[PDB]
Enzyme design. Structure first.
Site, short mmCIF file in Angstrom:
data_model
loop_
_atom_site.label_atom_id
_atom_site.label_comp_id
_atom_site.label_asym_id
_atom_site.label_seq_id
_atom_site.Cartn_x
_atom_site.Cartn_y
_atom_site.Cartn_z
N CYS A 231 -1.12 3.20 -4.17
CA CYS A 231 -0.90 2.53 -2.89
C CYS A 231 -0.46 3.54 -1.83
O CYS A 231 0.15 4.56 -2.13
CB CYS A 231 0.13 1.41 -3.03
N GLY B 50 0.45 3.46 -8.61
CA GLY B 50 0.91 4.58 -7.82
C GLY B 50 -0.06 5.05 -6.75
O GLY B 50 0.29 5.96 -6.00
N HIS C 151 5.70 -2.80 0.35
CA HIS C 151 6.24 -3.13 -0.97
C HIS C 151 6.84 -1.93 -1.69
O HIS C 151 7.28 -2.07 -2.83
CB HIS C 151 5.20 -3.84 -1.85
C1 LIG Z 1 -4.80 -16.04 -11.77
O1 LIG Z 1 -5.64 -15.33 -10.90
C2 LIG Z 1 -5.01 -14.23 -10.29
C3 LIG Z 1 -5.37 -13.80 -9.01
C4 LIG Z 1 -4.73 -12.70 -8.41
C5 LIG Z 1 -3.73 -12.07 -9.12
C6 LIG Z 1 -2.94 -10.86 -8.60
C7 LIG Z 1 -3.02 -10.34 -7.38
C8 LIG Z 1 -1.95 -9.27 -7.75
O2 LIG Z 1 -0.84 -9.63 -7.95
N1 LIG Z 1 -2.30 -7.84 -7.98
C9 LIG Z 1 -1.26 -6.94 -8.39
C10 LIG Z 1 -1.05 -5.87 -7.33
O3 LIG Z 1 -1.98 -5.28 -6.89
N2 LIG Z 1 0.33 -5.60 -6.85
C11 LIG Z 1 0.48 -4.56 -5.82
C12 LIG Z 1 1.82 -4.72 -5.09
C13 LIG Z 1 2.07 -6.19 -4.59
C14 LIG Z 1 3.45 -6.26 -3.93
C15 LIG Z 1 0.96 -6.60 -3.58
C16 LIG Z 1 0.43 -3.23 -6.57
O4 LIG Z 1 0.90 -3.15 -7.65
N3 LIG Z 1 -0.20 -2.03 -5.98
C17 LIG Z 1 -0.19 -0.87 -6.86
C18 LIG Z 1 0.77 0.22 -6.43
O5 LIG Z 1 0.37 1.20 -5.91
C19 LIG Z 1 -1.69 -0.44 -6.93
C20 LIG Z 1 -2.48 -1.51 -7.82
C21 LIG Z 1 -1.73 -1.65 -9.04
C22 LIG Z 1 -2.26 -0.91 -10.16
C23 LIG Z 1 -3.65 -1.30 -10.47
N4 LIG Z 1 -4.61 -0.95 -9.35
C24 LIG Z 1 -4.00 -1.07 -7.95
O6 LIG Z 1 -4.64 -0.84 -6.96
C25 LIG Z 1 -1.75 -6.30 -9.70
C26 LIG Z 1 -0.71 -5.27 -10.27
C27 LIG Z 1 -2.04 -7.46 -10.73
C28 LIG Z 1 -3.37 -12.50 -10.41
C29 LIG Z 1 -4.00 -13.57 -10.99
#
Ligand SMILES: COc1ccc(/C=C/C(=O)N[C@H](C(=O)N[C@@H](CC(C)C)C(=O)N[C@H](C=O)C[C@@H]2CCCNC2=O)C(C)C)cc1
Ligand SMILES: COc1ccc(/C=C/C(=O)N[C@H](C(=O)N[C@@H](CC(C)C)C(=O)N[C@H](C=O)C[C@@H]2CCCNC2=O)C(C)C)cc1
Lengths: 303, 303
Positions: free
Chosen positions: B145, B143, B41
């Protein structure tokens, strides 16, 4: 989101660890530039440990009596001297992995990472606090002496602790890197005991702020308190007094959450008087006091 | 003596971390030999995150669209491919700091260390378990990931986890280094929730053994139990069943302390039915389940 007891990355310190052997005692040394620092009881046998005469033991040692290995590379010692409770072994090669570093003496209530080592090789890394009674609650076995505690400030490793001894409490005592012990302890097998420990109040409050940042807010109540009223309650539960300097240090967490420090203190007073009634905060059933405010900020803001 | 949540030394993994930037998304990559592995992603914007078409997004990317930095040294990408949920960026320089390594898919209940990184630089290290519902209780911000989980087996780093997403529980989900998610999750912003978590029974028992080794023995009672009777009680308290394989894994701790596994199980049954009545074990007021038996042996025996 999430909150974990997090240690500094240890690679900069790992490149500094060596094995020091003197006669039959083997422990760890810290190799920085052309000097190896290690606990001076490396020159002891056990008959030299109830009342060791370190200066006497040392005068009978020559440079070749110290076997220093870094991996499968033996380093030649070309000089030795004793500073307080630490030996300084001059070696004929400067460590190419020496990082930028400082020697620091930390204050009670501050935290640091420990890289636990045996025979000069890393075992694991964990985070400790200097307790108000100048001990630390670590994890050390026979042969771990010379393991160091440190903080990493951007590029610089600030070495603040070298491990020397275990009190039969299961708590641990040591020196700064100039060889001065933290607390009243001496490097002898005698009847030393640490003073009574107290809970580090400013750290508990930082941890409650981390809880709020992470969405665990059930303990927030509607009240406020004065600093003096709070400290009167805290004292009964063996908490250290909270100073105005401590209040100032919590400024950044207070502003991030919009919770005044004295309001968070009213919530902590209620937790102390009433308990948690089965509930947990950040997964703990006890209040945690080994996260400094800087710890919390650093973890909740990405270094 | 002493017992701490201890992470593996992180220096071998630190030398592998780089920053990967694609358009405006920036996360971490793992640089091994001439390949950089990172979450796919990285090629998404946020409008590409509720139903991203990864293959579509990728075909519109050329090698120069990926900015990979290792310190203040930019690495040139000369090839890219997608394997499951991970991108493989071929680079024109092989990492000189590449350690001996393996890619491993771990099982639920096993532990590993996480090196949390932002913009390719280390933030801290901590120890995690793969929960039975294939999440981990970590500490990750925007950030982070591309941060990886690992174990160190003597010289070899066994990479087992790369970080991808946060569930709004505050729990975390990711892939092995072949890009296959742990658990039923997908790398999209939709309504995914993890199954109910359970307590890792064999790990709790290892931790009670660590307690005994450390001198905290108040919870040992005079009784024994059968494996079937124990599992009937454990089940009511949302503990996983203990298998005979699990019993065998506790052999070394049982022999060190002289406490039969089924005797320790009778002590745990009493703790589950009666609670701890205010007392702590190894400083915890709750039973801990993120130490494997190998964890305990390694910590209580010096690597
Ligand atoms: C209604 O019940 C629900 C159940 C599950 C969800 C969301 C799962 C989701 O989308 N998680 C997102 C995510 O991890 N997205 C990933 C990327 C996608 C493509 C899988 C991401 O942002 N990854 C981050 C980038 O590095 C790290 C994340 C984000 C910061 C917060 N902590 C972390 O680990 C979160 C930002 C909400 C929402 C509602
Ligand atoms: C009656 O009330 C008492 C109060 C205090 C004590 C002992 C203090 C002590 O002597 N500690 C010893 C120690 O740490 N010795 C140091 C060396 C001396 C010269 C200061 C040492 O062995 N250091 C070890 C070598 O590396 C590491 C120790 C030992 C293994 C256990 N865990 C550790 O950290 C322990 C072995 C009992 C005894 C009784």
């Amino acid at each position: 989101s999430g909150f974990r007891k997090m240690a500094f990355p240890s690679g900069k310190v790992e490149g500094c660890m060596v094995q020091v052997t003197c006669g039959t005692t083997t422990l760890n040394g810290l190799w920085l530039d052309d000097v190896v620092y290690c606990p001076r009881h490396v020159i002891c046998t056990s008959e030299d440990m109830l009342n060791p005469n370190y200066e006497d033991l040392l005068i009978r040692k020559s440079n070749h009596n110290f076997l220093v290995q870094a991996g499968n590379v033996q380093l030649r010692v070309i000089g030795h001297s004793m500073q307080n409770c630490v030996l300084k072994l001059k070696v004929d090669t400067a460590n190419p992995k020496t990082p930028k570093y400082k020697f620091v003496r930390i204050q009670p209530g501050q935290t640091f990472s420990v890289l636990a080592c045996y025979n000069g090789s890393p075992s694991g890394v964990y985070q400790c606090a200097m307790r108000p009674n100048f001990t630390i609650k670590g994890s050390f076995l026979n042969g771990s002496c010379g393991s160091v505690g440190f903080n990493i400030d951007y590029d610089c490793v600030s070495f603040c602790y070298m491990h020397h001894m275990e009190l039969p409490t299961g708590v641990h005592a040591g020196t700064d890197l100039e060889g001065n012990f933290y607390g009243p302890f001496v490097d002898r097998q005698t009847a030393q005991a640490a003073g009574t420990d107290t809970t580090i109040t400013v750290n508990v409050l930082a941890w409650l702020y981390a809880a709020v940042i992470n969405g665990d807010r059930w303990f927030l109540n509607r009240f406020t308190t004065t600093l003096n009223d709070f400290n009167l309650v805290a004292m009964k539960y063996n908490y250290e007094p909270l100073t105005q300097d401590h209040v100032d240090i919590l400024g950044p967490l207070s502003a991030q959450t919009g919770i005044a420090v004295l309001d968070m203190c009213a919530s902590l007073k209620e937790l102390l008087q009433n308990g948690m009634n089965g509930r947990t905060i950040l997964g703990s059933a006890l209040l945690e006091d080994e996260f400094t405010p800087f710890d919390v900020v650093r973890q909740c803001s990405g270094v």
